[PDB]
Curated annotation (Swiss-Prot), chains A, B:
GO terms for biological process: diadenosine tetraphosphate biosynthetic process; mitochondrial glycyl-tRNA aminoacylation; tRNA aminoacylation for protein translation. GO terms for cellular component: axon; cytoplasm; cytosol; extracellular exosome; mitochondrial matrix; mitochondrion; secretory granule. Its EC number is 6.1.1.14, 2.7.7.-. GO terms for molecular function: ATP binding; ATP:ATP adenylyltransferase activity; bis(5'-nucleosyl)-tetraphosphatase (asymmetrical) activity; glycine-tRNA ligase activity; identical protein binding; protein dimerization activity. Changing residue 5 to A: Decrease in catalytic activity by about 10-fold. Its main location: cytoplasm. Changing residue 149 to Y: In CMT2D; uncertain significance. Changing residue 152 to I: Found in a patient with mild left ventricular posterior wall hypertrophy, exercise intolerance and lactic acidosis; uncertain significance. This is Glycine--tRNA ligase. The gene is GARS1. The modification Phosphoserine is found at residue 494. The keyword Transmembrane helix does not apply. Widely expressed, including in brain and spinal cord. It catalyses: tRNA(Gly) + glycine + ATP = glycyl-tRNA(Gly) + AMP + diphosphate; 2 ATP + H(+) = P(1),P(4)-bis(5'-adenosyl) tetraphosphate + diphosphate. The chain holds residues 117 to 728 of 739 of the full protein.
Length: 522, 522
């Protein structure tokens, strides 16, 4: 199935990729701190994103505030940037997510069988409408299914709407009640005119922003999946409805990805692998502008370490907007990691009322494709998809991060610290920085095998061990180790920077290296 | 004196470096949005910082949340992370900063002269104690100087303490009242043990965090100086009080910087330029650990574009902690851009109660040096110190950003878009990326001189113009222009990437280039 997450989490906590925020205070749900190793990974993911989108598409980056006054979020959704129905408990006051309790409790009596078959079908009919039940309706369903507090046990209260925005006051007194932005896309809209003027009024242009957003979750209890603070990457691509073709679609048309259309969901079909070019041809994917980004998102996700076999794109379906969500399969099931919405009528129209004056005195209300990246979930998906366990009964752990994402690409290992290795270590380190390869000198105590096990544990792609022979014999050669296979070669210490650079940047494979340079074993 | 800021601000707004947040709503004070050009600059500043500190000192980066519960900030300062005295107005309710009104009003009657000389001395005696007057005391001073609302005009209310933290509720209901972090340093303290364990319990180690902090200012009205949301870079360097020597101090001991000690302030002396090595020797700067960071901060600030002649380091003085603040001179006067505090008794002690077990069963309470960077103010300081005006009565504008900080380093200018230049433009762009030089192809309409004026306006360091001769004559050569001097050369289009790389990275000077490659003029 998925992954031994109990092991993975232990390694993630022990090596301090990330951990519970304010742990020495009991901790806060939905809040996490990222350690040195987690930051390196996060920064690499974000940097890879900047190269994949901002640099590639000439996107106009923006940096807006997280503090937003009330009036601004009233023209978007003081209700629907999001409010979840919340049921309280008339003692023990504990709050719950309505959709969650009803669903879980339905699955309880849905599978408890002195029960009926006609009830199964009834509860299925209800589950297929959960997300779209209004308030009353839901309250009735709570009473009609006798839903009580899961962990015992008192009766429940009519599900009331609960806004997921963090309230605050921007200033002295209380005349400017503000909100912590629940999403980054809105800041871009408010800046459409300045962005348009910056692009000289021309019209295909993309605007992006990488920052934190806040969602006041009722009861987050699923690790990095449901969190209250998270880093998000947003793109707002603006197109003239007339020219709905992307000139660069042919670069992606040939990809094969799993598509899970709305119609495939209505009629209980399965996710279907499909050529992206065919997808647009067959009409399952509306246009090539939407198609291009879907393929670029696919390329980015697989590049960062997500498995293609556990990656799908789900179109939603009457639950306005043509959205395809990049979903990854984890131990929590299929989670939405990247949203990509095609939108005719959008949220700039509400805000500003902007338009672009395409020549001849015509005001154009541009269509908008907005790919939104859940960076933390993307990061967590990499953990699960990349985590492996080695053979021995000292069941050792390692992450198979792509070199472009791993905390650092190379680890130099000199034998027990001697004034002897230093000049060689220093030269390797300096030469390694000159080829743009990240590294950390291992000044750690233990066997040469135990030290590599530690670096494997955090996913370091490569390793160079410097021994006495390296210092004292005259082709000065050290050994290069591959993380995944654990296989080693013996190359000249002055060429190593070049071949590690060529391995990180997929210019050559390990097989290529083992074909040019001698093998090594202990 | 300083700078024609009225002009600078116009250019900063017109080119959209940054602008007022929510402008189309009346705007919010202390909140600003950074445009495409501003982001490029900001990202470059931050990246230069990561290289200058994190990479150079092997600092352990961390990523903590901005949401902090009440109890955590109660062990730091529910009063003194900061509360400013605020005076309200018994009609027109307008709120004011007490320290501000009193000072401004004192300077009013301090310089209004049917007045006395003995009053001058009295008001000076008061001004030299402003920051340290308690609440009553201050209320009396308000009455005793008959301080009324500046912009008319009703009587004022006793100055009450006003916490500058943004209040919020982390969760459903209201049992976990939280705060938006006013500073980044605290998150590092709470993670001292995990950071210590990550450093294997050894003890000199530095921990850093780059993120946003929030300060609910009463009435911000000084551009990017006093803001409510800002990006901050924090370093927490932990040292054993026994080994208070930095092995790398000799790399900085030879710098010459202006030092403004506490004793020089008490006895109205002037800021004094001084060799950093001498400074530690003469005892003005306590130790070399503090000294090293002061010099590293100086190096960073000048590297990013701040003028050495308008940069000083001010030690404060009974207003616990040995702090030196990097201050820059602007049109607003001397502003604190980087704080650097040497602290014996710190804020981990309050939080956790951590310690490091230096061998032999001794628990060490480590001293902490914490350089904190106000990135936005640093950025603004660069604007003022770097902004210039060219000669002609079409008074043209340009920013002299260092190449390492400028939005992008190079601008390629082909003559009016022709299928002719494209292959040369494409090759230059691709070759330019291969040498790690940022660039943007100018697809703009206008004269070849007007187009460069536009790129100069945003501070682009270099420019390469491709003309017909470049395409049709057989040493294919284009012209390279220097931003500052406007001088040009004519080099082979395939060598240009190398020499632009060598100019950006201060490997060679423009004079060197003009000594190897032919000159050009129109
Ligand atoms: Cl996320
Ligand atoms: Cl700042």
């Amino acid at each position: 199935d998925i992954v031994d997450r109990a092991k993975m989490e232990d390694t993630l906590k022990r090596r301090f990729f990330y951990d519970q925020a304010f742990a020495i205070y009991g901790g806060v749900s939905g809040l996490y701190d990222f350690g040195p190793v987690g930051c390196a990974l996060k920064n690499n993911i974000i940097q890879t994103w900047r190269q994949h989108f901002i640099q590639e598409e000439q996107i106009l980056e923006i940096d807006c505030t997280m503090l937003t006054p009330e009036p601004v979020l009233k023209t978007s959704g003081h209700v629907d940037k999001f409010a979840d129905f919340m049921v309280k408990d008339v003692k023990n006051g504990e709050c719950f997510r309505a959709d969650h309790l009803l669903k879980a409790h339905l699955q309880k009596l849905m599978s408890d069988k002195k029960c009926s078959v006609e009830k199964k079908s009834e509860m299925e009919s209800v589950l297929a409408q959960l997300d779209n039940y209004g308030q009353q309706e839901l309250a009735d369903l709570f009473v009609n299914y006798n839903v009580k507090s899961p962990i015992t046990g008192n009766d429940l209260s009519p599900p009331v709407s609960f806004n997921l925005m963090f309230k605050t006051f921007i200033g002295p007194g209380g005349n400017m009640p503000g909100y912590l932005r629940p999403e980054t896309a809105q800041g871009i809209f408010l800046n459409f005119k300045r962005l348009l003027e910056f692009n000289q009024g021309k019209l295909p242009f993309a605007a992006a922003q990488i920052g934190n957003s806040f969602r006041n979750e009722i009861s987050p209890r699923s690790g990095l999946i449901r969190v209250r603070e998270f880093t998000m990457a947003e793109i707002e691509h603006f197109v003239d409805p007339s020219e709905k073709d992307h000139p660069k679609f042919q670069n992606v048309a040939d990809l094969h990805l799993y598509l899970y259309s709305a119609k495939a969901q209505v009629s209980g079909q399965s996710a279907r692998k499909m050529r992206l070019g065919d997808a647009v041809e067959q009409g399952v994917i509306n246009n090539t502008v939407l198609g291009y980004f879907i393929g670029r998102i696919y390329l980015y996700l697989t590049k960062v370490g997500i498995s293609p076999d556990k990656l799908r794109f789900r179109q939603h379906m009457e639950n306005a907007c043509d959205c395809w969500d990049a979903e990854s399969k984890t131990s929590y099931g299929w989670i939405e990691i990247v949203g990509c919405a095609d939108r005719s009528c959008y949220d700039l129209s509400c805000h500003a009322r902007r338009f672009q004056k395409t020549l001849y005195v015509e005001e154009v209300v541009p269509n908008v494709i907005e790919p939104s990246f859940r960076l933390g979930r993307i990061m967590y998906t990499v953990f699960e998809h990349t985590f492996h366990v080695r053979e021995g009964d000292e069941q050792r752990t390692f992450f198979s991060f792509p070199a472009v994402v791993a905390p650092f690409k190379c680890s130099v290992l000199p034998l027990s610290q001697n004034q002897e290795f230093m000049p060689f270590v220093k030269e390797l380190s300096e030469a390694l920085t000159r080829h743009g390869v990240s590294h950390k000198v291992d000044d750690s105590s233990g066997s040469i095998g135990r030290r590599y096990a530690r670096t494997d544990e955090i996913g370091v792609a490569f390793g160079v061990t410097i021994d006495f022979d390296t210092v004292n014999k005259t082709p000065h050669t050290a050994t290069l180790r591959d993380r995944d296979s654990m296989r080693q070669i013996r190359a000249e210490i002055s060429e190593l920077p070049s071949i590690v650079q060529d391995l990180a940047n997929g210019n050559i494979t390990w097989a290529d290296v083992e074909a040019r340079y001698p093998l090594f074993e202990g």
